[PDB]
Design a protein around this nucleic acid. Structure first.
Lengths: 89, 119, 103, 93, 43
RNA sequence: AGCACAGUCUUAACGAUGGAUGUCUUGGUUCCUACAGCGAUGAAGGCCGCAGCAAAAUGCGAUACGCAAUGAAAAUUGCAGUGACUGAAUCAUCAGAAUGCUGAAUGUAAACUACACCAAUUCCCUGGGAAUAGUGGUACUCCUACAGAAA
RNA sequence: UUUGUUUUGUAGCAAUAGUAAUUCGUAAUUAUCCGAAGUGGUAAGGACUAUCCUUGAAAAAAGGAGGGAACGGCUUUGUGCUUUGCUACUCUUAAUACUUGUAUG
RNA sequence: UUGUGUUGAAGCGAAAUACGUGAGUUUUCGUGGAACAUCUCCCUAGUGCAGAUCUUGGUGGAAGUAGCAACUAUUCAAAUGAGAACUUUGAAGACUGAAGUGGAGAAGGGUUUCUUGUCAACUGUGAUUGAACAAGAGUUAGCCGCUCCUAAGGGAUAGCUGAAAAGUGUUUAAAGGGGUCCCCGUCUCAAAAGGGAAACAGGUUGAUAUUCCUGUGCCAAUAGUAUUAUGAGUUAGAUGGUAACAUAUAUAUAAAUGAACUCCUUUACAUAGGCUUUACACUCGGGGUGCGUUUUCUUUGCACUUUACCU
RNA sequence: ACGGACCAAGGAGUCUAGCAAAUGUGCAAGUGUAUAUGAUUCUUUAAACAUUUUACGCAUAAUUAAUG
RNA sequence: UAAAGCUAAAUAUAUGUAGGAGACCGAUAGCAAACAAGUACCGUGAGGGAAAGAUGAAAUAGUACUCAGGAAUGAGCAAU
RNA sequence: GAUGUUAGGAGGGCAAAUCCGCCGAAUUUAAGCAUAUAAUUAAGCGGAAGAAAAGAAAAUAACUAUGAUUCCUUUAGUAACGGCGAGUGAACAAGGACCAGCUCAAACGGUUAAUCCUUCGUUUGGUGCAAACCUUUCGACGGAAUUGUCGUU
């Protein structure tokens, strides 16, 4: 009819199925089944797949800040004992 | 503008008092900035850095005096004890790795590797 | 071919029973020493319609024997039983319409 | 785990950011004896009441709060009739 | 809608904040700009 | 002051449009070499913030485009402003301090800044003196030791 | 301490507010805001009648009842109980003071 | 190997009494402004384009052409402005016709809202307009909602399967609460239209209003001790009516003993049909007030004449 | 009959393994020094240089299912 | 001399990090990305995924002044 | 056995190029196709290290014999497998890199668990400015252990 296959039905496009997914922050959290389509947030694992190199590489490590590992880097070459400070003037 | 070495000799009381009055002056500066007044807007950076400095000195004093409290005692809190890598923490001690049974200890002691030459 | 309609029934997705307004399962009293060696009389407090089935059910109130209180039972009503009637259950219950006896 | 640094919970300096001086805020002071403040989002009615009490010698009658789109909380603070809202506004600017 | 969650409202405020132009004094030395009607933020 | 018909097509000169060509190159690619785990001591990832004027990127975490310390060491600047005549301005190093909400996420939840229970908690002086509704803890499985109940 | 007869009040809210007017420096004064009815449009309620091989949610929360466990106060003997001497006491709302971590939202 | 370059290299445009048969080579002028060649011999390859409905980019004739056609309809004068058919004001003619381009909301959007500027692009004609651009500002709740409950149902725990991933969810659960030894008992999420503690009126801004102001209320909570005060009851819990039942009016109907253990009620429910009551709506007549018609007629036509929640 | 409106730039028998033929080169009943080692070589050099007088491939002999 | 167990080296490394190179590519090439690139943007979602380098030695030489225009702009006897 | 917000601890997730287990195709080739091939591959699940895994003969040979594992040259496109079609395909010896061997069980020890752990103390000296760190052996306590720790081979 008037809500036919195309333009008519597109008028009823409200009520999204997906939302923000607190873990990824990406709009893929399926609201009805409470599960992220991008990372599977309720599950403990990350929902990666080897058949999508693109998807792997656009969210692997190093894509973000690396808030801690980047600090711990170069301590292998310094080899300072924890709690040590440079000798004062 | 205060440097980090001259206040290193203050007690915690006046250290906190200096922090408090410095925060109050920063708050006044921010109030003026929010108002139309804008002449003093450039001292906000200096006051903020002074707050950072006094906080650094106070926290370092507190941490050192807390370590003095758990000197030895073998049961320091987790933050006080070492923060190596997790697997380094779980690694066997060098003594444990070098530990040997009496049988192989006496074998090694009685027949060690020897240095020698040839004609 | 594809899965036929009869096959899809066992999946139990839309072929589950429409049971929202059912009043409960129709069961007699659980076997008890009273029922084994005597009569226990329950008062049929009400008779109601269970939307799934055609036979009316009977809300019957028994008095608990192990503790003070009243227990509620839903028993498929027999033709001719009426609210306010006492039905006896057990071996020694008299043979009359509505009573529960061993065969 | 023991903590050595002094607490970083939000005190008055940081709970109350600055007064609001927009046209609406400025008008409210003379008419309805109220002051408009900008606060950090983590504040609440009790936090704001205690903060203004111990930052300025003012006693609160009631606080109304809203969350702006700029990431802060706007607080309409009605002063009691014991002390008017204009001389305190003059005192702080 | 008129009724919103706190996180959604803060996200809307952040997206509005990121829509401002480059400061003029900085231009003495932007492209990630959106219009509410052309490109929906979908979030 | 005057004269060319118009259009269509061809040629040359000069220009428009366009961005080829040449020349550039703080980029890529491949090989060789060397080292190599991060996480309940809370990771990777995601949000949210942070500058005097500040959107992005970069950096950082309520001490928030940076603190302290160490080496260098006079600039830093768009304006404003800050600096010695060197713990000061700026780099570099980075061991100390600090490191928001989350996330394995782990008190219960989650399109909630929702709701529990247990210790009240934190700070200052050398037993007091203050301030705080704030702060910690509480997942599941398992190991070692312990406890009092069970046959 | 009862029954008949008047006045008052839009029953309090309430006119101080609104509304429509007339004036006055340009913010104030003044007057009105009351006598009756009809139609049945919408909504709700009530008391009913009828229909079903269709009988048309639950829980949080709240209430009623059945039952009858416990029993004054001041002092005292003896090992909560028996006891001696005296009687003005138990609940309920509100307010105040102190303690309690800061004792409304 | 041996050369060319700021006394201008590569490239490019036009060329040449030029050479070759030809791919080409070499020169001139102009432009260009920094590199270029090696034919001495050889090495190497991502090495030669007219096409592949080839790929990417750019540009044509079509062509100032098709077209700018639903929604009946515009006109006069003035203001602003560089500029006005489509900005504003006044007048007129009309439309929408309470099943409305009128008021409120939901989903969705996310600042489009308001004010002040403003016109590079957009607003398929214009444009001084604007949902465009710029700078500021704007969203106030114990009573409106969420938050709480449970539904269709989702997740999870115990198990049990499975290499795990996962599948099911009490299938041998020793699984929180209560009084004071016992009783009850998987957890958690899922409704902004279901259930549900409690608010009305007037006013106020440029933009918010059951949220602000004024006034008047209502709901929930209010720990322990001690004082007062209010009421009852008692020399261990009141009283009327035959009855249906009623009674505490203190600022305020607050108190009418009551455990364990139980049994109910409310919450709490379909559809159709008419009858009836009330409120709101509409309408008629009278009184008052203001306005309008008034060549003629008109004791006239129109507007106002109001009263919330709570007690 | 199909593709081609126009122009620029890009655009397609290559690389490796293995065999043969052809031709050039070295040595010749021998040929190839494999992996690896040494050595005042260590920008180039990841290449060049070297190999205490039955390693291995191919060839030097064929034929047979095969003992041979 | 099975049905028990440990063990370095020679070995591999389309990952991360840090170095050094090349008869490699030279902005339609080379990674998708020489740049604010897994960015903008598209899809409910899984995912898809660009375009975009060059003034000059020096802008611490980025166009002053005049005229004409409402302005954009244009012109100059003016100007780096 | 339970139960414990008893004391002290561990696991969980990310990351994968190399590495270790499982699970597991089809495109393709055969000029069709079904065994075969693709391939003990891709996808899927799980688990580690700077390497992993393998490893100290229940091995090979048949010789004048060799002597853990791994890797390189080769054996060798060979023996063999196969609608004996398409295709597939090792091992021993030989030359090298490297080179490393060991311990439980079982045996033996009872005029004596000779073992081990937890907690609390003592000093033996040292590098650090400090923070911290390395050595140290005398205990005492509470346990575990004869349903078997330790010593010998």
């Amino acid at each position: 009819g008037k809500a036919g296959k195309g333009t008519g039905s597109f008028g009823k496009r409200n009520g999204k199925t997906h939302f923000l997914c607190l873990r990824c922050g990406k709009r893929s959290y399926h609201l009805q089944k409470k599960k992220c389509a991008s990372c599977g947030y309720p599950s403990a694992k990350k929902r990666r797949f080897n058949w999508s190199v693109k998807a792997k590489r656009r969210n692997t490590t190093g894509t973000g800040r690396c808030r801690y590992i980047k600090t711990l880097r170069r301590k292998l070459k310094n080899k300072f004992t924890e709690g040590s400070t440079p000798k004062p003037k | 503008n205060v440097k980090a070495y001259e206040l290193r000799t203050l007690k915690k009381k006046e250290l906190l008092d200096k922090l408090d009055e410095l925060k109050k002056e920063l708050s006044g500066l921010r109030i003026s900035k929010a108002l139309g007044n804008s002449a003093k807007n450039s001292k906000i950076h200096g006051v903020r850095k002074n707050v950072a400095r006094v906080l650094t000195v106070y926290n370092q004093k507190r941490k050192m005096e807390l370590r003095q409290l758990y000197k030895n005692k073998k049961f320091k809190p987790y933050n006080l004890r070492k923060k190596l890598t997790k697997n380094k923490r779980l690694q066997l001690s060098p003594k444990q790795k070098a530990a040997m049974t009496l049988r192989q200890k006496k074998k090694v002691q009685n027949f060690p590797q020897r240095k020698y030459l040839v004609v | 071919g594809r899965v036929i309609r009869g096959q899809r029934k066992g999946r139990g997705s839309i072929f589950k029973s429409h049971n929202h307004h059912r009043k409960g399962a129709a069961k007699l009293r659980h076997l008890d020493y009273c029922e084994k060696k005597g009569y226990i009389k329950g008062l049929v407090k009400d008779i109601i319609h269970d939307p799934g089935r055609g036979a009316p059910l009977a809300k019957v109130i028994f008095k608990r024997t192990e503790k003070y209180g009243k227990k509620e039972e839903l028993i498929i009503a027999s033709e001719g039983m009426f609210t306010g009637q006492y039905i006896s259950c057990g071996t020694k219950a008299p043979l009359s319409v509505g009573n529960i006896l061993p065969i | 785990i023991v903590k050595s640094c002094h607490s970083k919970t939000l005190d008055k300096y940081g709970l109350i950011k600055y007064p609001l001086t927009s046209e609406k805020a400025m008008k409210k002071i003379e008419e309805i004896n109220t002051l408009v403040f900008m606060c950090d989002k983590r504040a609440n009615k009790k936090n704001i009441k205690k903060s203004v009490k111990n930052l300025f010698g003012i006693e609160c009658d009631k606080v109304n709060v809203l969350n702006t789109l700029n990431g802060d909380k706007k607080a309409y603070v009605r002063l009691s009739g014991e002390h008017d809202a204009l001389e305190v506004a003059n005192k702080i600017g | 809608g008129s009724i919103k969650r706190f996180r959604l409202k803060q996200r809307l405020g952040k997206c509005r904040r990121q829509n401002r132009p480059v400061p003029h004094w900085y231009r003495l030395k932007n492209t990630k700009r959106r219009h509410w009607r052309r490109t929906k933020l979908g979030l």
